Each structure stands twice: as structure tokens, then as C-alpha cells.
RNA sequence: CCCGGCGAGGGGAGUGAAAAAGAACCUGAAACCGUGUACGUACAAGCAGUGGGAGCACGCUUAGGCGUGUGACUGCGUACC
RNA sequence: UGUAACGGGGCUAAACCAUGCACCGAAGCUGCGGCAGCGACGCUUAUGCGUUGUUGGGUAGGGGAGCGUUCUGUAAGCCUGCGAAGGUGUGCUGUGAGGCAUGCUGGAGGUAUCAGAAGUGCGAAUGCUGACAUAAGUAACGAUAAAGCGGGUGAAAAGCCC
């Protein structure tokens, strides 16, 4: 079913994000609640809002009943990577990755 | 870099 | 320290293979109120037992 | 190049490639090692050739039945209408009109036709002569170019 | 039923009525062919050879199609000193189809 | 005037990786690897076309061995046999002979050993 | 046309009884590894296990000729230290009776998964009795 | 209009030929990172290919070979300048 | 560093000598078909050969013949908003660099044949610019003067306030 819920540009490295995301996959949709509710990661958190988000634009949009509803093809590929400059030993320079991701999650009812 | 130091010197060797 | 050569995407998924979170799945039932909660631990409205334990 | 000769770091001791200048060929911010200059690319031809070459795209034009001789020719008003009406009833749409007279009233009005160019017979050019589908010439054109090709 | 027989410099062993690949030879496309180079004509009683061109066997042939084989890339490479050569072939072939093994 | 190599490099670079297409690692995907790749098999194919035939050739040879120390000669004999008896069939089609029909390649066994006698 | 390739699937395996008692280790062994790799069948494929099953009993009563009875060392190394162990072959029938037939054979077999999966085929034994009567293995004189 | 923090971001509605044109904006390649499907892989050693090659799942006309992917096993083969 | 001076299994012939018959064994030779070069040839003639002989591993190097890109003339000609380039796959096709047609995106440009000029074809030069992997979610989070509790704001407080 259509009327997915994508998340653009994530303050979060795009690894931990999908660590998170593995443990939902295909499960019912209260259960990713119970499971995101108790995963003590803020990506856990910062997943478990696009999730909400989702269940709401179920409900708003589409074909709700959210009893009958599952949480079927969620992803998270890497976004753009800021640039910034560390200062490090010997005058010599180097470049850390402030790293965002997208958060697509894609809910359907059958 | 604006800078690239000196290399470390090496074993002697000499 | 430093490498021979870089290793493989294949190497960096057999490594994460391990790497994979556990969830718990096993939130239990109160007995007075009924909210979800986690082993040995009180609810967010500190239902512990059916007992008000935080009296707050 | 706008920049300095300047060695941009050392001959040795760093872990980058080796570094003379900035304007040089293979770095940003500068270019073409051999650099094209205003030549002439005009090149000599022999005056017997051209001439020959002459001869030679008269004597085509002879038997391709691309040359039409006509009498005197000339346009009554400098209007671009009656040219165009007298090229229809000799159906002319794409000819080279090659006179020796040059006067004012076929120069005028031949301008803004694109097919329709209007030459002296001194100063011919054999580009002309090939790419136009039709050259339509005057007796006195002839006489004149009989002349100066000799 | 089997027979052997050579087209092409090279023994083929045959069953009536299949569409065999063998050499292009200097046939048109809807003419038929005889083969008297027949090596071998096999059924309930066997009859081998002593000699070639047995008794009288004959093969005739159904000559279908006359297509180019797949392309083949010869890639020549002689390591370190400056040298590669890179050359396709196709091969001429013919499918013809038995009409008969005659003993 | 200034040519840009930029649609020419991308045909050239297609070219290879459509051949180089399902090969381990970076040997499909990155082209400095995949060309290469391209030139090596190359070689191994060019190899394996003369190799193809040598291991298909003494393959024939081992059936017929094989066949024929299953009705009892052993091979030189049986090659002498068929050369005495004038028998220009080949390793190929006499092997193809002796995995499915014995019968065919017992009577071809027994002129072989009347040939020899 | 193709030539013929065999399938794992229709090979049609057979299991036999060989007699070790009074025969020459090597030439018997060879003889073996020929059967188990499949030599005499005429559908053998270079890359498809065409074996048969072989029973090898009274496997101690093997013999060599000349002086290879007490001076044919059977060399093994640990993967250690540098303690190279080594066994004659009297000390080697008196302890472990199918490792003969078992390293005679696997030295006549080519490396690889191949190899390994024919020799699962060798059903050596020690004694005159063995366990596998339920599939008649006939015997294969030599 | 709704979620979300009178955020950021997203989804409906609408403008628009087109929002696979959203101010990060015409067209959006490759390197890199995944998601969904097919195959193989947890007893097997090496320039990871090539040739042969069982099996599997997809499509065509036929009432069987091909098209394409994986390709167990197997001989040979120690990258380019 | 381990048998480790037949490759190994192993062999009293499966070693060697003398002799003989066969087999295996190269891309060598022959058979089939195709391409290119050279000199002659039956006689065909700006052209393939009924045929014949011979050549065709190749660096540095020399000679010859071609493919692809931009622009110009041809060319205000042709295709084209029922769809051009670029991108992306499939199927044919030439001995080859490549060409042809088409599914999808895209949105207004490209150019037949023949000639000309090149900033004319990248795999390397510890080549340069931009992006992204790798090591790797690893070290580290920057004086071992030290935090603990309650209340308040807030979606969330160990670091904000009392």
C-alpha cells in the first residue's frame, strides 16, 4: 500500500540508524511501538517519531483500522555529509563528517 | 595543509 | 597499524554480522492497570505489582 | 597565466607529487601547454592555377547545362517584386546574377533575397560559381570574363 | 537407425529426422544433398565397416539454414612489452535435416 | 577548437563493463580492474580453445579405455585393431558408441580383435 | 552433437567385497582407487563421483615383499612445535590395521572436494565381519 | 488539513504541461550506501578467471530447444605499466 | 621451521640393459571453411577469381589503410513537442576502432554523403580539482579540583535556574 513517510536530513550517522531500524521488519505495527518504546538508542526515538508519523498518515489518509496494518519496507541510505575542520597534533589538519541520513519507511494495511 | 612538516629522521644506518 | 590493503564489502558485513541489536521482546502485563513494561521495572505511572510503590 | 612562478611547497620531504608551479599544464587554475596564437590561414595559390581552376568550372557549368546566356538584363524600378517576378517567369529560384554592368538598381533590390546574389564580373569567386544551382550570365559578363580569363 | 557419417572432415553420428550444424559448403539454400560418406549404419543388426564407403549407404539431406555462428573475440595481450591484438570471428556454418538413412 | 571526451569515455567504459558483468569484488565495478579483467579472460579464453579440445580428446580416449577394459582389450591394441581394419571413425562419435548402445560397440570390439588375429 | 555428461543423480552406484588377505599393498591398492574413482564404468565424468561402494576386509593381513615390512616409515607432521611423529609399518598394523589401506588409497586419489567425496566410498575394515550385508556387496576378485 | 516541539522534516490538498520542476530546485552518469526478488554459500584453501558442467527460478513459440541469472564440481591459469 | 636429494601414493618390477609391436603426447603436420599480403597465371579487364605457389609470433622502429568527437562549407537542405541530444538496457552487425534500430527518463536541439582545421581519443606520471569508501563505529571526547539530592521551565534536564 502507498502513502509512505520518509524523513529527510537526520542529525545521525546512517550505520546506527539501520541497527536501529533491523530489528522492524515486517512486524505488526503496536509491536514496533512495545519494541521502539524500550530500545534505549536516540535513534530508536528519532525512528519511533517517523514511525508515528506514519501510523498518523494511515489514519489521516488512507485506509486505516491500524489493527490491521504493517510496518512492511523500511530503509535508511546515507544523506549528505557536512564538512568541518578538526584541529589536530603536528599543525597538520583533518576532516570530520557530520553524517545525516533519510529515514524512508513505506506502512501498508494487506 | 597550508604547512606539511618535516619528516621524521631515520635509523642512522650510516 | 597501518594496512596492506583495504578490506571488502564483504569483509565490513561479515564483521557487522555480529553487530546486530537484540531486542527484548518481552514486555509484560500489570496486573492492576494493564500498561506495558519490562521485567522487574516500574511503568511510566509507577504501577509496581499492582501496588502504587511511588505513591506520587 | 595570472600567477606566480612560486613552488607551491617543497622539492622533497612531502608526501604529495612534485610541484614546480601553479600555471603549469596539469593543475587547476591555468591550461593549455601549446597555446593556439593569431596566424594567417590564408595560403598561396598560383595565378595560372586559379585561372585554369576558372576554366575548369566554366567548362563544367557548359556541360551540367547550368549556364544560361541571356541578352542585356536589367530591372525597371529598384523594387525586389519585379525581380522576382521576372526570376518566375524564367523559372530562377536559386541563380547567381552575374553581370559586367554593376549599376545601382540590381544591387539595391537583390540584398534581401536569400537565393539571389548579385556579383561584378571582375571580381568572381569559383564558390559561387559551384554552389549556386544556376548561373545566368550577360553577353557583355561574357565578353568580359572571356577577357580576363583570356 | 543412428548412422555415422563425415561432412565436413569430422564424423557426425545422426538420427533420422534432427537438424544437425555442420560446414558451409557451396549449396543454396533450398537444395537437398547426398552423402555417399557414410562410415557407419547402426540398428537391430549392427553393420560395421572393413572398409570405407560400405555397400552403396547414402544420406540425403535437407540443407535449412546457413547462419553465422556466435562472435568469438580473440584478444592478444603480450604482458610488458607494449603490444595487444583484438580480433572477432564468426563462423559459417549450416543446419541441414535428414530426410532418410538408406542401407 | 576544444573536443570534450565525455560521451566517447562513457561508451568505451560501457563497452568493457558489459563484458566484465558478473565478476567477484571490484572486478565488475571499477573499470581499471574490469579492464583488465576483460584482458585476462581474454587470454584464458584463447587458451581454453586449443585446452577445450585436449581435454575433450583424452576424455574420448578414457571412455573408450574405459569401455573397452569393460569388454575386456586394453586400448593400444584396440587402436592398432581399428588401424588394421581401416576404421577412420573417430575418438568422438566410437565413445559416443560405447556409453549408450553396447551392443553397436561389442560388435565394433570383436572386428577390432578379428582385425588383430 | 554434445557429448555425453553424467548427473549425481543417475549414477548407478554398486557395493562390492575385495579380498585384502595375501595380496601386494600397492598394486591392490591402486586397484582400489581405480574402482573408486570409476575407471571401468563407461559413463565416467572427470567432475561427477561415478564410484562404487568397496568393503575391504582382513585389511592387517596385507603384505609387502622385501624388507618394506620393517622399514616403510609412514612420516605425519602435528602442526607444532617441531615433534615430528613417525610410524613403521609393523607398528602401524599392530595399532591402527586400516590406515594402510586408508593412506594407500588417499595417496592414489586427486586433492580437492572430488576426491574427498569418492573416498567416502572406501569401507575399509579390520576384521572378516562387516555390517553392511543388508546390500549385498558381491565379491570383486582381482 | 494532519503528525511532529506555536521546531526541523514529512504526507494529503492545490497552483502548475510536468512538483520521477520544491527554493539543496533543467537534464541527474559513475565511484559509494541500501531496500525488494532469483540462485549459490557455514568441510572448504590462492590474481577469484576461462572451458566443460548437474541443479534451481523465470519467459517464448511449441507440445522442445533456446533467451538470461546463479552456477556445486572439475582441468589449466602466480594482476597491469 | 616438517617426511623434504623418484613430484606424491607407492613399486621386487611399476628399476635398468638389448630388442620389437602399438598407444598417449604441441597451437607441429593433415582435413574443412573464412580473412589479409606478394609475384606470376586461364584469360577475365577501372573486377572477382574455376584455379596455383607462398606468406601472415613480435619489441624498439619503418611503411600502408581505417574508426570515433567539435566546428566550418555543402546546409535557411533533412528529422523533430504523435519527441533531437545526454543518460540507461536489449537485439542485430563489421577482421577491428564502432555503427544501426528500439523499451524508459528527459526536454529542445542534432545533422546524411564528401572535403578542411585540430585544445582530436587516458590506466598509470609519489599527476591536479570535486565527491565517496577503507581502516571503523576503532582510538579519542583535550590536567585524577569532585560531585550528590529536591523543586521550577520545557516534548525531553547530570550539565539551564533556585
Given at each position: ?110 | ?14 | ?56 | ?66 549556364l544560361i546566356v541571356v541578352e542585356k538584363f536589367s ?76 | ?103 | ?64 579405455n574405459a569401455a573397452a577394459r569393460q569388454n575386456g ?45 | ?142
Amino acid at each position: 500500500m502507498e502513502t509512505i513517510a520518509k524523513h529527510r536530513h537526520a542529525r545521525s550517522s546512517a550505520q546506527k540508524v539501520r541497527l536501529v531500524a533491523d530489528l522492524i521488519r515486517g512486524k505488526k505495527v503496536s509491536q514496533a511501538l512495545d519494541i521502539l518504546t524500550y530500545t534505549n538508542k536516540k535513534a530508536a526515538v528519532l525512528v519511533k517519531k517517523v514511525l508515528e508519523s506514519a501510523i498518523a498518515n494511515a489514519e489521516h489518509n488512507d485506509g486505516a483500522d491500524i489493527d490491521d496494518l504493517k510496518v512492511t519496507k523500511i530503509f535508511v541510505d546515507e544523506g549528505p555529509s557536512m564538512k568541518r575542520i578538526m584541529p589536530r597534533a603536528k599543525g597538520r589538519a583533518d576532516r570530520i563528517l557530520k553524517r545525516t541520513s533519510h529515514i524512508t519507511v513505506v506502512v501498508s494495511d494487506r | 595543509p597550508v604547512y606539511i612538516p618535516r619528516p621524521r629522521p631515520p635509523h642512522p644506518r650510516l | 597499524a597501518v594496512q596492506q590493503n583495504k578490506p571488502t564489502r564483504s569483509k565490513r558485513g561479515m564483521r557487522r554480522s555480529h553487530d546486530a541489536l537484540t531486542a527484548v521482546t518481552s514486555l509484560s502485563v500489570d496486573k492492576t492497570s494493564g500498561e506495558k513494561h519490562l521485567r522487574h521495572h516500574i511503568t511510566a505511572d509507577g504501577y509496581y505489582r499492582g501496588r502504587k510503590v511511588i505513591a506520587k | 597565466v595570472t600567477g606566480s612562478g612560486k613552488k607551491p611547497w617543497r622539492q622533497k620531504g612531502t608526501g604529495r607529487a612534485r610541484s614546480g608551479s601553479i600555471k603549469s599544464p596539469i593543475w587547476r587554475s591555468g591550461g593549455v601547454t601549446f597555446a593556439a596564437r593569431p596566424q594567417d590561414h590564408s595560403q598561396k595559390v598560383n595565378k595560372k592555377m586559379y585561372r585554369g581552376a576558372l576554366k575548369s568550372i566554366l567548362s563544367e557549368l557548359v556541360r551540367q547545362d547550368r549556364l544560361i546566356v541571356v541578352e542585356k538584363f536589367s530591372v525597371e524600378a529598384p523594387k525586389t517584386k519585379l525581380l522576382a517576378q521576372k526570376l518566375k517567369d524564367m523559372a530562377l529560384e536559386d541563380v547567381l546574377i552575374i553581370t559586367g554592368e554593376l549599376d545601382e538598381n540590381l544591387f539595391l533590390a537583390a540584398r534581401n533575397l536569400h537565393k539571389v546574389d548579385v556579383r561584378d564580373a571582375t571580381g568572381i569567386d569559383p564558390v559561387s560559381l559551384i554552389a549556386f544551382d544556376k548561373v545566368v550570365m550577360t553577353a557583355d559578363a561574357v565578353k568580359q570574363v572571356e577577357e580576363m580569363l583570356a | 537407425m543412428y548412422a555415422v557419417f563425415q561432412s565436413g572432415g569430422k564424423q557426425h553420428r545422426v538420427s533420422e529426422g534432427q537438424t544437425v550444424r555442420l560446414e558451409k559448403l557451396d549449396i543454396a539454400t533450398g537444395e537437398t544433398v547426398e552423402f555417399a560418406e557414410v562410415l557407419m549404419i547402426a540398428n537391430g543388426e549392427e553393420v560395421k565397416i572393413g572398409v570405407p564407403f560400405v555397400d552403396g549407404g547414402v544420406i540425403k539431406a535437407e540443407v535449412v539454414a546457413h547462419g553465422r555462428g556466435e562472435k568469438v573475440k580473440i584478444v592478444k595481450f603480450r604482458r610488458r612489452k607494449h603490444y595487444r591484438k583484438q580480433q572477432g570471428h564468426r563462423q559459417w556454418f549450416t543446419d541441414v535435416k535428414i530426410t532418410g538413412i538408406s542401407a | 577548437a576544444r573536443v570534450k571526451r565525455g560521451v566517447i569515455a562513457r561508451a568505451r567504459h560501457k563497452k568493457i563493463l558489459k563484458q566484465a558483468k558478473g565478476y567477484y569484488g571490484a572486478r565488475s565495478r571499477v573499470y581499471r580492474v574490469a579492464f583488465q579483467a576483460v584482458i585476462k579472460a581474454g587470454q584464458y579464453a584463447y587458451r581454453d580453445r586449443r585446452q577445450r579440445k585436449r581435454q575433450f580428446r583424452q576424455l574420448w580416449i578414457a571412455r573408450i579405455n574405459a569401455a573397452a577394459r569393460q569388454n575386456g582389450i586394453s586400448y593400444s591394441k584396440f587402436i592398432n585393431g581399428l588401424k588394421k581394419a581401416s576404421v577412420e571413425i573417430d575418438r568422438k562419435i566410437l565413445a559416443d558408441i560405447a556409453v549408450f548402445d553396447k551392443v553397436a560397440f561389442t560388435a565394433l570390439v570383436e572386428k577390432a580383435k578379428a582385425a588383430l588375429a | 552433437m554434445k557429448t555425453f555428461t553424467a548427473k549425481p543423480e543417475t549414477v548407478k552406484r554398486d557395493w562390492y567385497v575385495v579380498d585384502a588377505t595375501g595380496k601386494t599393498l600397492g598394486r591392490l591398492a591402486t586397484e582400489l582407487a581405480r574402482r573408486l574413482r570409476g575407471k571401468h564404468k563407461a559413463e565416467y565424468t572427470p567432475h561427477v563421483d561415478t564410484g562404487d561402494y568397496i568393503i575391504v576386509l582382513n585389511a592387517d593381513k596385507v603384505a609387502v615383499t622385501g624388507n618394506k615390512r620393517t622399514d616403510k616409515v609412514y612420516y605425519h607432521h602435528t602442526g607444532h612445535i617441531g615433534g615430528i611423529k613417525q610410524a613403521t609399518f609393523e607398528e602401524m598394523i599392530a595399532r591402527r590395521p586400516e590406515r594402510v589401506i586408508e593412506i594407500a588409497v588417499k595417496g592414489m586419489l586427486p586433492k580437492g572436494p572430488l576426491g574427498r567425496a569418492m573416498f567416502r566410498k572406501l569401507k575399509v575394515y579390520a576384521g572378516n565381519e562387516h555390517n553392511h550385508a543388508a546390500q549385498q556387496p558381491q565379491v570383486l576378485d582381482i
